[PDB]
């Protein structure tokens, strides 16, 4: 409906990256999904997600969720609620947000556009 950005958990990206709070169940929009280079492993997917204010490209799907992508319920423009995630920090200091459980609240076809004008989150 009207006020589309009101559908998304504005500020959740900053909260995840600044406070590391994991009890939240934020509602985010998928902007894009792509495989990352794997060799002899199951494929792994990276997501560019939006909370309406920011985008963040450091989301990775737990492999148990791969069927959501491969059967196309999880795709660009869909709106989803994250029910379980963890943050991991690499040796170089970069953080990755691993999505363990999520629910698609609105299909890509039912949303159809990038909501709002989110800007990339900086570190
Ligand atoms: C920081 C971050 C967040 C999400 C995905 C990535 N990422 N993207 C690619 C790729 O192939 O593009 C590879 C990685 C990667 C992730 C973890 C460890 C090593 C490499 C990196
Ligand atoms: O269940 C899964 O697939 C899973 C659990 C944890 C990770 C993971 C993925 C990428 C990473 F970089 C790091 Cl540190 C962890 O993946």
Curated annotation (Swiss-Prot):
Higher taxonomy: Eukaryota, Metazoa, Chordata, Craniata, Vertebrata
Glycyl lysine isopeptide (Lys-Gly) (interchain with G-Cter in ubiquitin) cross-link, renumbered residues: 25, 91
Source taxon at top rank: Eukaryota
Clinical disorder: Pulmonary fibrosis, and/or bone marrow failure syndrome, telomere-related, 6: An autosomal dominant disease associated with shortened telomeres. Pulmonary fibrosis is the most common manifestation. Other manifestations include aplastic anemia due to bone marrow failure, hepatic fibrosis, and increased cancer risk, particularly myelodysplastic syndrome and acute myeloid leukemia. Phenotype, age at onset, and severity are determined by telomere length.
Protein role: As part of the heterotrimeric replication protein A complex (RPA/RP-A), binds and stabilizes single-stranded DNA intermediates that form during DNA replication or upon DNA stress. It prevents their reannealing and in parallel, recruits and activates different proteins and complexes involved in DNA metabolism. Thereby, it plays an essential role both in DNA replication and the cellular response to DNA damage. In the cellular response to DNA damage, the RPA complex controls DNA repair and DNA damage checkpoint activation.
Subunit structure: Component of the canonical replication protein A complex (RPA), a heterotrimer composed of RPA1, RPA2 and RPA3. Also a component of the aRPA, the alternative replication protein A complex, a trimeric complex similar to the replication protein A complex/RPA but where RPA1 and RPA3 are associated with RPA4 instead of RPA2. The DNA-binding activity may reside exclusively on the RPA1 subunit. Interacts with PRPF19; the PRP19-CDC5L complex is recruited to the sites of DNA repair where it ubiquitinates the replication protein A complex (RPA). Interacts with RIPK1.
Posttranslational mods: DNA damage-induced 'Lys-63'-linked polyubiquitination by PRPF19 mediates ATRIP recruitment to the RPA complex at sites of DNA damage and activation of ATR. Ubiquitinated by RFWD3 at stalled replication forks in response to DNA damage: ubiquitination by RFWD3 does not lead to degradation by the proteasome and promotes removal of the RPA complex from stalled replication forks, promoting homologous recombination. Sumoylation promotes recruitment of RAD51 to the DNA damage foci to initiate DNA repair through homologous recombination. Desumoylated by SENP6.
UniProt modified residues of type N-acetylmethionine: 4
Name of protein: Replication protein A 70 kDa DNA-binding subunit
Subcellular location: Nucleus; Nucleus, PML body
Family that this chain belongs to: Belongs to the replication factor A protein 1 family.
Gene name per UniProt: RPA1
């Amino acid at each position: 409906g009207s006020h589309m950005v009101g559908q998304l958990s504005r500020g959740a990206i900053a909260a995840i990256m600044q406070k590391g709070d994991t009890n939240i169940k934020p509602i985010l929009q998928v902007i894009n999904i792509r495989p990352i280079t794997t060799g002899n492993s199951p494929p792994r997917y990276r997501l560019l997600m939006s909370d309406g204010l920011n985008t963040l490209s450091s989301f990775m799907l737990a492999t148990q969720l791969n069927p959501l992508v491969e059967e196309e319920q999880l795709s660009s423009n869909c709106v989803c609620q994250i029910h379980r995630f963890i943050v991991n920090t690499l040796k170089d200091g970069r953080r990755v947000v691993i999505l363990m459980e999520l629910e698609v609240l609105k299909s890509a076809e039912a949303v159809g556009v990038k909501i709002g004008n989110p800007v990339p989150y900086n570190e």
